Amino acid sequence: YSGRDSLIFLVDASKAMFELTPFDMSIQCIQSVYISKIISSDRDLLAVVFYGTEKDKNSVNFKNIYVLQELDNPGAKRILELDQFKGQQGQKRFQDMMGHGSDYSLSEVLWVCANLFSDVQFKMSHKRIMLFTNEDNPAKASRARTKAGDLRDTGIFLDLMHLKFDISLFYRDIISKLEDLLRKVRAKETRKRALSRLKLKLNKDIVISVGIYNLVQKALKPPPIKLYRETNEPVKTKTRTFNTSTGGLLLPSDTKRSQIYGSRQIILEKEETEELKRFDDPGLMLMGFKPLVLLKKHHYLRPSLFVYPEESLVIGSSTLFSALLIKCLEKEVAALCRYTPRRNIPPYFVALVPQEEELDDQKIQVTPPGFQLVFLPFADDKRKMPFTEKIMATPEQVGKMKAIVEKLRFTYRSDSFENPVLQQHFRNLEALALDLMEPEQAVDLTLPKVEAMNKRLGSLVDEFKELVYPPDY
Amino acid sequence: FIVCLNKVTKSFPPLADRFMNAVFFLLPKFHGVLKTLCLEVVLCRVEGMTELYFQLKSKDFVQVMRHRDDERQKVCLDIIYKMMPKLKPVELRELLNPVVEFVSHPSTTCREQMYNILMWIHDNYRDPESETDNDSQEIFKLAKDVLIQGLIDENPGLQLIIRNFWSHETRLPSNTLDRLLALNSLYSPKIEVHFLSLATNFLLEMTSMSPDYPNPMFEHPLSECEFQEYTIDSDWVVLYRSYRHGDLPDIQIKHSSLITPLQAVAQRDPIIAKQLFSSLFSGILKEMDKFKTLSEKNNITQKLLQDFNRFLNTTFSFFPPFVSCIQDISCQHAALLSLDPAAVSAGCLASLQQPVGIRLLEEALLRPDVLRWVELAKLYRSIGEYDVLRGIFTSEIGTKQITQSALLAEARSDYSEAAKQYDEALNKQDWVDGEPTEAEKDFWELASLDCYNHLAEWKSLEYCSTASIDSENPPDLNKIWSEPFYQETYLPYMIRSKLKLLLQQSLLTFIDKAMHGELQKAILELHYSQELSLLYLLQDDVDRAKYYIQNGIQSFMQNYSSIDVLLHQSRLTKLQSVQALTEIQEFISFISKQGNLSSQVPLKRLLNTWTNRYPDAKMDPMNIWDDIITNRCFFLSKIEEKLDISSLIRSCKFSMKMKMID
Amino acid sequence: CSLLRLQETLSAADGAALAGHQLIRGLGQECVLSSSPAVLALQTSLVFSRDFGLLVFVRKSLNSIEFRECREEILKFLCIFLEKMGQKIAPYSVEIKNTCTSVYTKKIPALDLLIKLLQTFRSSRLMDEFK
DNA sequence: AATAAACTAAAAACTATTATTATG
DNA sequence: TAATAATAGTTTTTAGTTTATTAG
């Protein structure tokens, strides 16, 4: 989906930033937001265009407006522009070259904002404007309120907090908690493109699209491009199956794919090579229903994803899936599907465990109404060790470890942990922009936390040792 | 949405009064025909925008003007037309500055619309009464000039209504006298070719009010018979005289019946146009001769002399008919005999109308006088009145001897020792005349240059170009040196010197400075295009040389058409440029046959050809000797090399020397 | 002339993105202007085919998205010269093919340049077939 | 004295265009 | 005997092919 929220930094200079002075904290807010945006989305554009200025620095050059980093993909440019002014000395030098609080017409700055939002040429789902003031800064406002309402009609959102929820009295009508904006949000990729929906062969006469969009799945380090070691510019990396016995690059008419099986390399053709990958057709070929009791769940270990419908290709996606998930309550089975994302794919036996919508009070689409992919394993990959079940539970031991650990009851917030590599290197990119150290470390909480406080909660496994040797080493 | 909105705004303008923000939030987002529909909506409800010039600030009216669409551009012009009554004059000429470049476009409809804009401005906003700031005066100058160029619309109706607009007593005051005065102040620096024609048109169309001009001049036919309109076959001309015809000669034709064909031939034939203009102007002078105050007369003559300056100053082709008309008009009138001798000299020289200005200056002398004398001497040298020139430099103003001994050298044509005398004493200013006129000083400089151009001393040609001149300018010259007028005179010699030195670099510097400013390039191609052709044919960028040679052929043809042929010396000098033009053109055309280009069969048989077709200097001036020598050497050096041998080339050098001798 | 100096100004303009936009605008204007068969226009377009090198190297020939539209425009003008008003095919074809190979080296108008070269091989066989 | 593999290896995304058959 | 129509096309995140030592 093309379309995002375009945000501009329209910050007032009415010395409502200069009373810590609100300027420094506002600049920290905007820099943290830009740090989030550079590591999250370049599709969203950031405009460092402040008003209330002693200068008329803007496109139409209206009263008390300054442009620093207009609407653009986030980057270190705005980071350094705000970094040179974030400090109190930065604030005073800022007030020197930019200006102090001055008079102007709010219609002027709102017109400039309208020009900025109408000059970008991106299909943009939403538009937002942020603004900071210590208190309500205020004809001068009636035209301003009219223009702000019109911009709101154009999909532009207005954001303002008074840094005195106490004193914005003259701005209550004008207006349409920044600790979250202090980089609480950070490093979340925004892509909305993914594979075409697969065709569920639920039966032999009607097939229904299923929405499998890998758009908000795992995100990691940016693309490492083989830049030149001297000037930091990429290389083309001319690579292919090339020849030394005959020289040059082998042509497709001269390349044959084989399989070294038994005692020989079974030479086949490329056509057979890549057409062998298919057993049938693309889509979710449904065999039937498999009771959830027959899941190994010690082999449901690979990267698993969700199975959602898609009411875009067939009318009956939403209809039949709504009925199916309505009747999933009385079923202990899963939609036994074979999975081919495209043509020439080996279908995988998939059990569709019903994961219906968790519509909360606000109906947040947590676990959206559909199914979750249950792994039906095979016989080639698991690190199996020989089983040993001569050991059962003993009441003393079970009670002792229960009292040791039962206090620590978590809730398993699925996104609670932070990926080490991803956030690590993203904030490291932040530091590279800042030209500084390794900023901070990300980890999948892999350092245990209970072991330092299990005895604080009354651990008994440490207290009760089954052997003079560490009972479980 | 926007499509149906542009569809309904014409269907109902008031409905557009709820979506100004919609279009303004989308106009710098709408760029296809969406932009066109936005223009439609804006135009239909421009009154809906009290202030929308700030849209132009934000929506980039200029970039829309870059787009090519009579639709888009024209409706933008119409929007301005709606809002230029409310437009601020500063914003008005701000918007004018990108507009003026659009004149003369093949659209002729958006072109017509912007010409309506220009006339509207000159009527009520750029009008001569709203001239309170340099803003307004610049706007009015631009508008008057572009409407002057609108008098000549290929649309006869458009230029006709433009003529009506002008001739209107507001634009052009009704009285023939003050109409004439406005015409004298209305000339455009580019219309002197047809300025006289259009002025005659306006003057004669005023006579329409004369309630006898449409009447017959005769009512008493000597031979009276039936007079009915006569017919004529016109198989693939429109009548201007109906031919009320019969057995006997009528004389009861209308004054109009003659004047209208007369006006048409005047506006079509430039030479008869200027003759008629001079005659009518003189008759107007007799009209003021009745009882009019001489104070007004001398004021008119003063402003007319100023107008003549603004003509000669702002002209660069120096239209030989227009120049001659101005010269004679000055001739017949003492208060008009007050011309700058230098100005009339330059006009004659650029128009090849030397003798007309010679007669004018003769009347001026027999009427400063020293400047008049020196200008007459300059033109006498240019033509060759070296006898009267001897008389003048021995009696009138010539008290020196280096000038006179160099005069003997030039009459003996051995310019060598003439330039020796001059470069000997040209930097020193003390003389028997005390300080000789700076005209005589740059005359000595030009004589040294004419020597070192006459001789093959191109190295000393550049040397006397640079240093041997009086130290009134740095040695080398470029566009930053055109401001001194003597340097302008030297420019043909400058190209000659540099081109021959390369044939043996400030030249290319001045060439690019000549493209920098199309006036420079236009003058160079008018007067030195063949030199450019020879240069860039030697510079091996021969496509540019071919470009220059075709432009030079056209310039030669047009100049010879414009420059009077009855001045047989002027026509002969014009046709002396034939040799180099044909050289470059035919060598480029024939160079496709490159087989006989380095071999010796274009050498053994065609080297003696170097020095076979050589004239005598009496019928071929020896500057044209240098011309044709360069031409033939270029021919038979380029055709003998770069795909009998050496002794033959030396023999041809030697024979070229004897022909120089003869 | 007006065409030569205006195109030179457009090339000299080559922000880089805005420079590309104004270059494509001016080139579309000249394309809808260059529909003239006069030999003078043919000669001026010829002599400015030499300045095409600077035109495309201020375009950087880089397939850059800020000058990818200029590539479209120059190829559309080449399509204007695809028909035989470019009577003088000899003096430029070799440097033209070398330059266009450079432009493709350092999208769709690259294929358009290939089509131009194929047309030259159909018309300007002599010097092009050697290289 | 040879078993151990998470160091990436590829494909739809609505962009949008042409191309219709616009005419006897 | 002369407009509107579809390959027209993309900022393709997993084909599931590299990191990982007791076999002698």
UniProtKB/Swiss-Prot annotation, chain A:
Q: What induces it?
A: In osteoblasts, by FGF2.
Q: Which GO terms describe its biological process?
A: activation of innate immune response; cellular hyperosmotic salinity response; cellular response to gamma radiation; cellular response to X-ray; double-strand break repair via classical nonhomologous end joining; double-strand break repair via nonhomologous end joining; innate immune response; negative regulation of DNA-templated transcription
Q: In the UniProt record, does the keyword Acyltransferase occur?
A: no
Q: Which stretches of sequence are listed as region Interaction with XRCC5?
A: 312-421
Question: Modified after translation how?
Answer: Phosphorylation by PRKDC may enhance helicase activity.
Tell me which EC number(s) this protein carries.
Answer: 3.6.4.-, 4.2.99.-
Sorted keywords for this record are: Acetylation, Activator, ADP-ribosylation, ATP-binding, Chromosome, Cytoplasm, DNA damage, DNA recombination, DNA repair, DNA-binding, Helicase, Host-virus interaction, Hydrolase, Immunity, Innate immunity, Isopeptide bond, Lyase, Methylation, Multifunctional enzyme, Nucleotide-binding, Nucleus, Phosphoprotein, Systemic lupus erythematosus, Transcription, Transcription regulation, Ubl conjugation
- Report domain Ku positions: 200-407
Residues joined by cross-link Glycyl lysine isopeptide (Lys-Gly) (interchain with G-Cter in SUMO2):
K226, K256
Phosphothreonine sites (modified residues): T394
Residues bearing N6-acetyllysine are K256, K270, K277, K400
Cellular component annotations (GO), alphabetically ordered: chromosome, telomeric region; cytosol; DNA-dependent protein kinase complex; DNA-dependent protein kinase-DNA ligase 4 complex; extracellular region; ficolin-1-rich granule lumen; Ku70:Ku80 complex; membrane
Cell location: Nucleus; Chromosome; Cytoplasm
State a single Gene Ontology molecular function: protein-containing complex binding
Chief subcellular location: nucleus
This protein's source sits in the domain of life called Eukaryota
Segments carrying the region annotation (DNA-binding) are: 216-280
Subunit composition and interactions:
Forms a heterodimer with XRCC5/Ku80; heterodimerization stabilizes XRCC5 protein. Component of the core long-range non-homologous end joining (NHEJ) complex (also named DNA-PK complex) composed of PRKDC, LIG4, XRCC4, XRCC6/Ku70, XRCC5/Ku86 and NHEJ1/XLF. Additional component of the NHEJ complex includes PAXX. Following autophosphorylation, PRKDC dissociates from DNA, leading to formation of the short-range NHEJ complex, composed of LIG4, XRCC4, XRCC6/Ku70, XRCC5/Ku86 and NHEJ1/XLF.
Q: What does this protein do?
A: Single-stranded DNA-dependent ATP-dependent helicase that plays a key role in DNA non-homologous end joining (NHEJ) by recruiting DNA-PK to DNA. Required for double-strand break repair and V(D)J recombination. Also has a role in chromosome translocation. Has a role in chromosome translocation. The DNA helicase II complex binds preferentially to fork-like ends of double-stranded DNA in a cell cycle-dependent manner. It works in the 3'-5' direction.
Q: What family classification does the UniProt entry report for this protein?
A: Belongs to the ku70 family.
Name of the protein in its database record: X-ray repair cross-complementing protein 6
Q: Which organism is it from?
A: Homo sapiens
List the lineage, top down: Eukaryota, Metazoa, Chordata, Craniata, Vertebrata
Q: State the covered range within the intact protein.
A: 32 to 534 of 609
Curated annotation (Swiss-Prot), chain C:
Which residues in this protein are found as N6-acetyllysine?
Answer: K106
Q: Where in the cell is it found?
A: Nucleus; Nucleus, Nucleolus; Cytoplasm, Cytosol
Q: How is it modified after translation?
A: Autophosphorylated at two clusters, the T2609 cluster and the S2056 cluster. Autophosphorylation induces a conformational change that leads to remodeling of the DNA-PK complex, requisite for efficient end processing and DNA repair. S-nitrosylated by GAPDH.
Quaternary structure and partners: DNA-PK is a heterotrimer of PRKDC and the Ku dimer (composed of XRCC6/Ku70 and XRCC5/Ku86). Formation of this complex may be promoted by interaction with ILF3. Component of the core long-range non-homologous end joining (NHEJ) complex (also named DNA-PK complex) composed of PRKDC, LIG4, XRCC4, XRCC6/Ku70, XRCC5/Ku86 and NHEJ1/XLF. Additional component of the NHEJ complex includes PAXX. Following autophosphorylation, PRKDC dissociates from DNA. Interacts with DNA-PKcs-interacting protein (KIP) with the region upstream the kinase domain.
Name the protein family.
Belongs to the PI3/PI4-kinase family.
Point out the gene that encodes the protein.
PRKDC
Species this protein is from: Homo sapiens (Human)
Query: Which protein are we looking at?
Result: DNA-dependent protein kinase catalytic subunit
Disease tied to this protein? Immunodeficiency 26 with or without neurologic abnormalities: A form of severe combined immunodeficiency characterized by reduced or absent T and B cells, recurrent candidiasis, and lower respiratory tract infections. Some patients show dysmorphic features, severe growth failure, microcephaly, seizures, and impaired neurological functions.
What function does this protein fulfil? Serine/threonine-protein kinase that acts as a molecular sensor for DNA damage. Involved in DNA non-homologous end joining (NHEJ) required for double-strand break (DSB) repair and V(D)J recombination. Must be bound to DNA to express its catalytic properties. Promotes processing of hairpin DNA structures in V(D)J recombination by activation of the hairpin endonuclease artemis (DCLRE1C). Recruited by XRCC5 and XRCC6 to DNA ends and is required to (1) protect and align broken ends of DNA, thereby preventing their degradation, (2) and sequester the DSB for repair by NHEJ.
Phylogenetic placement of the source organism: Eukaryota, Metazoa, Chordata, Craniata, Vertebrata
